[PDB]
Design a protein around this nucleic acid. Structure first.
Ligand code: MG
Ligand code: MG
Ligand code: MG
Ligand code: MG
Lengths: 105, 179
RNA sequence: GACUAAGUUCGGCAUCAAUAUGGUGACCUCCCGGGAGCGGGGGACCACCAGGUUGCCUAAGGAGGGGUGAACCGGCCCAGGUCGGAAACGGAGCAGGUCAAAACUCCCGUGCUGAUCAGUAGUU
């Protein structure tokens, strides 16, 4: 239950910083989905679980392609980093951003 | 061609406001008159209306700047505009002193124009508080008006004399600042 | 009738820019704290505002007065609802309210500019 949250808004290049986004547009992507996010995180060997029915507070678009939240574990609950490659939320996001595009395209 | 500046302004001014100091009305009067003049008129010169017209241009600006100073009494943002109108008033006055140096206009009118140009010039510098430059212009004005007054009888010279009486307070103020 | 300037009346066109200080709104890019909504802080840029100096500025360019600000596009306050939350509370924001400060627009002033009326004068 002590896992960092991650909304797809954080990575969406068609959203302003005030609309949620957490990473520079240059590194961001178009319309990332919680599904896409979970898949690229898990596939690197991260412990991730997907909450299909959480919405972003700042998200306004009531249709399914923008719903969803991805929870990720960084820590084994002895305080140590599950992985050394992923110390921070930002380190997660930037990676997901880097990996999502190799899927569909 | 002929144009009696000081007499014109003094009679226009008194008939359309400046009896009570209403520079709005008089400026309006200058504007409308300028309409009539250009309408009738519409290479240096032919008639003497051209000279009357440019004077009205200098009069409009001058009167405005004066309306403005009554207003900038409380609205210092207007004082900026005041000084602009006044600088414009001189531009039209210079442009006037430019037209009256054409050799189909008598020297009496030459005198008036350079005396008028001096009056306004005196006024601008007096508002910029340029006390030496302003007093130069006020004496230049006083000198020329005195020159005009001698060449006429005392009756004709009355107008000129009251105008130098009129600017004498201005002359006095400049002095006590260069003391 | 011709010349002279007033009076009457309704239109068209048009309406500059730079500095110092503070302000607003956006947008971009970094840190820092957090399980969320979110919290702390460094830069970059843009728009507008107030009002303090001004000009290689005007034919004339007020630092006026208003109104709209909606079917989603301004900012603010936001019932409900809603998203986040164990909750406190918060986000986004509707109905409604509201504006020095998106954008739009009318009025006043100012400038040019058609025009009206009396057959009015002043003087023939
Ligand atoms: Mg961050
Ligand atoms: Mg108009
Ligand atoms: Mg900023
Ligand atoms: Mg301003």
């Amino acid at each position: 239950d002590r896992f960092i949250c991650i909304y797809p808004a954080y990575l969406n290049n068609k959203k302003t910083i005030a609309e949620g986004r957490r990473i520079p547009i240059s590194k961001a992507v178009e319309n990332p989905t919680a599904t896409e996010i979970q898949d690229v995180c898990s596939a690197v060997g991260l412990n991730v679980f997907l909450e299909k029915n959480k919405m972003y507070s700042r998200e306004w678009n009531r249709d399914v392609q923008y719903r969803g939240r991805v929870r990720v574990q960084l820590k084994q609950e002895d305080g140590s980093l599950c992985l050394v490659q992923f110390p921070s939320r930002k380190s997660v996001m930037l990676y997901a951003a880097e990996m999502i595009p190799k899927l569909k395209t | 061609l002929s144009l009696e500046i000081l007499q014109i302004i003094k009679e226009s001014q008194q008939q359309h406001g400046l009896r009570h100091g209403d520079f709005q009305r008089y400026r309006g009067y200058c504007s409308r008159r300028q309409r009539r003049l250009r309408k009738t008129l519409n290479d240096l010169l032919t008639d003497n209306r051209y000279l009357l017209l440019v004077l009205m241009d200098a009069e409009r600006a001058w009167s405005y700047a004066m309306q403005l100073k009554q207003e900038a009494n409380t609205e210092p943002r207007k004082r900026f505009h005041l000084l602009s109108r006044l600088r414009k008033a001189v531009k039209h006055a210079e442009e006037l002193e430019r037209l009256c140096e054409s050799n189909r206009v008598d020297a009496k009118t030459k005198l008036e124009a350079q005396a008028y140009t001096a009056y306004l010039s005196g006024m601008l510098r007096f508002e910029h508080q340029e006390w030496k430059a302003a007093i130069e212009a006020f004496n230049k004005c006083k000198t020329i008006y005195e020159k005009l007054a001698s060449a006429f009888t005392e009756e004709q010279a009355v107008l000129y004399n009251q105008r130098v009486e009129e600017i004498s307070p201005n002359i006095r103020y400049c002095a006590y600042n260069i003391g």
